[PDB]
Amino acid sequence: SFDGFFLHHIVEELRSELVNGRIQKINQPFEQELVLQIRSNRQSHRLLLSAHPVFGRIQLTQTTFENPAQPSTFIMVLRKYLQGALIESIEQVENDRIVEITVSNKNEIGDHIQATLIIEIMGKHSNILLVDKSSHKILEVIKHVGFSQNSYRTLLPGSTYIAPPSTESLNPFTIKDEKLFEILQTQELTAKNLQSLFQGLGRDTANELERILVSEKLSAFRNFFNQETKPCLTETSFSPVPFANLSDLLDTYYK
Amino acid sequence: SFDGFFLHHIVEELRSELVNGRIQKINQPFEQELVLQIRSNRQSHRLLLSAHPVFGRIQLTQTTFENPAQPSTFIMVLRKYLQGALIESIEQVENDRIVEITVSNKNEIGDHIQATLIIEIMGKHSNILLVDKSSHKILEVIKHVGFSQNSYRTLLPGSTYIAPPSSLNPFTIKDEKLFEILQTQELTAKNLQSLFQGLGRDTANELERILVSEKLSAFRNFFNQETKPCLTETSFSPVPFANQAGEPFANLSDLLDTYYKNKLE
C-alpha cells in the first residue's frame, strides 16, 4: 500500500508542488512526526513526514495539527537549518521507501549552507534525519539510536550518516529494455516472484501487476484472432494477416 | 502457412463469393487436385481443391488448367452429383484444416439429392471426398485407402465417412479458460500449438512474439502512467487496482488524509 510504487507517485507530486518553495514553519505534532509549512509559487502547503511505527508515510496534508507549547531539541536544531530554507530537490532512493529533501539556506553569519531532510520507512525501523551535505554528519534525528560497539550505524547528532542497506532486487521504473526483456521472457511473473525480482512492490501492487500482465495478454490474444483479413507474403510462406484477397495471394505464392 | 488460422480467413471469402452459386464444370487437372467452375452473383469463379501432400489447399484461382482427355471414375461420380448443383453452405470444421461444402441437386428423374464435398488438408493424408448427406457414405474419394490392420478408417466408395483423428479453438475459447491459460501456461510457440487447434508454426511464432511484446508494453505502461488516487478494500493505490473501493481523488494527499483520518484517536 505505502510501498515504493506508491511513494514514486507521491514524490512526483511532491517535487512539482514544492521544489523552489520556502520552509516557513517547522513543528512536531507527535513524537515521531514532522510537519513543515511551505510556501511554493504563492501557494502554501503542509507536508507531513511520519515515522509512525505502523503508519509511517510522507504526504501533503490538509489536517490541522495541535503543536506543542515548546519546541523539543530536535525541532530547534531543525529550524536552525530549515527555517526559511529553499527546497532544491525531492528524490526517492531508487524504488525503496526513502525520500531525500535537499535544501539550501543561510546561517547566522550569512554563509549559504545545504542540508538534507531524509525520511526512512524500513521494515524494522523508521526514522527522520537531517544531515549536513558537505560533511555527511547527522545534525538531528527523530529517534536517537545510541552508540553501540560494532553496530551498523550510530543515529546521533555528530555521527556520519550511513544509508540503509539495499537489496539485489531491481528498480522496475528504470530497468533497461534489455534486462527487463530477459526477466519477462524467462521468469514466472507471479506476484510473489515480482516482489523478489523488483524493488518496492507491495503485495497488492504485485498482485495487480501480475493481473495486468495476464489481462493485457488476453487483449492482445483476442485482437490477433479478430483482426481483418490482410493478405501478405512472408519470407518462406504467406499469411492471412501481416506477421487484395487471399486467393490472389496464393496464386502468386505458387509460381 | 495454410493452417487452420489461415483457413478461417479464406473460408469467409469463399462463403461470400460462392454460397448460392451453381457448379457448372468439374475437372481433375492433376491426380490429387479438383477444380470447380462456379457461377455466382452473375460472375464465374474457379475453385481449386488440392490434396497434394505439400501444396494441399482450397482457394479461388485465376489460373487455367489442362483437363485430361477423359474424366476418371472419380470425376464421373462427382459430376453425377455436382453438375448443376447449388452451393448451400461452406464451412470450416472448428479451426481444423477441414472444409465442408454442402450442395443440393436433382437426379435424373428430378428427385432432390444432397451431398457434402469435403477437403482435408492433412499433409501426407490430405484427401478430397464426396459424401452422401443422408446415408453418410462416401460416394467417391480422390485418394482411395483400403482396409489394413492399422487403418483408422477405410476411404473407399460405399464406406461410411469418418472424420480424421482430432486442443482448443482459439477463436471461440471463453474468457475464463483463456485467462487461466495465459496466467499459468508457457506461451512458447510450441506450447501454443499444443494448446490451440489450427496454429501452424509460423502463426504460432507470431502469436508467441505478440504476447511477449504485449507483456513488455504492459509492464512499461504500468510503471509510466498517470497518477489516479483510489482507495481499495483494505488500503489504497496510486492508480486504480482490481479491488478498488469508492471513487478516485484529486491527489494523493486527499486520498491519504481520508484513509488515515480516524485511524487513531
Curated annotation (Swiss-Prot), chain A:
Name the family the entry cites: Belongs to the NEMF family.
Organism annotation: Streptococcus pneumoniae (strain ATCC BAA-255 / R6)
Tell me where it resides: Cell surface; Cytoplasm
Which protein are we looking at? Rqc2 homolog RqcH
Q: When the coding gene is removed by deletion, what phenotypic consequences does the entry describe?
A: About 50% reduction of binding to immobilized human fibronectin. Greatly reduced mortality in mice (tested with encapsulated strain D39).
Indicate the span of the full protein covered.
Answer: 2 to 264 of 551
How is this protein organized at the quaternary level?
A: Associates with stalled 50S ribosomal subunits, binds to RqcP. Interacts with human fibronectin.
Q: What does this protein's UniProt record list under function?
A: Key component of the ribosome quality control system (RQC), a ribosome-associated complex that mediates the extraction of incompletely synthesized nascent chains from stalled ribosomes and their subsequent degradation. RqcH recruits Ala-charged tRNA, and with RqcP directs the elongation of stalled nascent chains on 50S ribosomal subunits, leading to non-templated C-terminal alanine extensions (Ala tail). The Ala tail promotes nascent chain degradation. May add between 1 and at least 8 Ala residues. Binds to stalled 50S ribosomal subunits.
